[PDB]
Ligand binder design. Structure first.
Ligand SMILES: Cc1cn([C@H]2C[C@H](OP(=O)(O)O)[C@@H](COP(=O)(O)O)O2)c(=O)[nH]c1=O
Ligand SMILES: [Ca+2]
Length: 129
């Protein structure tokens, strides 16, 4: 897999973000995660955490997997990195997301995120509390 440049346009919500990628505005949906909605418990905190992570980054990168790169809504499907730290993994590690939406061929970092979820769960963090 390869990391590619992008720039923040706007944080959106818990697990989507609007990035400029190859010069074009796109909404990205984070691979391999599911989050609470804004009006559910831990939704605001997921949203805030994603927002902070992307807004505070000096370098955003986009890493596509081996499979589908856009979903049925036109959202890009990637692993997103903020100063080298994976946002998808960070949300899971903090118990603000669960591993989810694991489709075959777009699952290179599954076991990495499952490990993260396991540690968040052990720690009883947030959604696991
Ligand atoms: C994360 C992800 C979501 N999706 C689709 C499946 C879900 O369809 P439905 O809308 O029909 O449920 C939806 C969940 O996204 P959200 O969790 O952002 O709603 O996005 C993919 O197709 N591939 C993916 O990798
Ligand atoms: Ca949502």
């Amino acid at each position: 897999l390869h990391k590619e440049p992008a720039t923040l346009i706007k944080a959106i919500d818990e697990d989507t973000v609007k990035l400029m990628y190859k010069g074009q505005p796109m909404t990205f949906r984070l691979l391999l995660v599911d989050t609470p909605e804004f009006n559910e418990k831990y939704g605001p905190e997921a949203s805030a955490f994603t927002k902070k992570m992307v807004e505070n980054a000096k370098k955003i990168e986009v890493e596509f997997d081996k499979g589908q790169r856009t979903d049925k809504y036109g959202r890009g499907l990637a692993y997103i990195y903020a100063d080298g730290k994976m946002v998808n993994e960070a949300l899971v590690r903090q118990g603000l997301a669960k591993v989810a939406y694991v489709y075959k061929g777009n699952n290179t970092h599954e076991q990495l995120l499952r490990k993260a979820e396991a540690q968040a769960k052990k720690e009883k963090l947030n959604i696991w509390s």
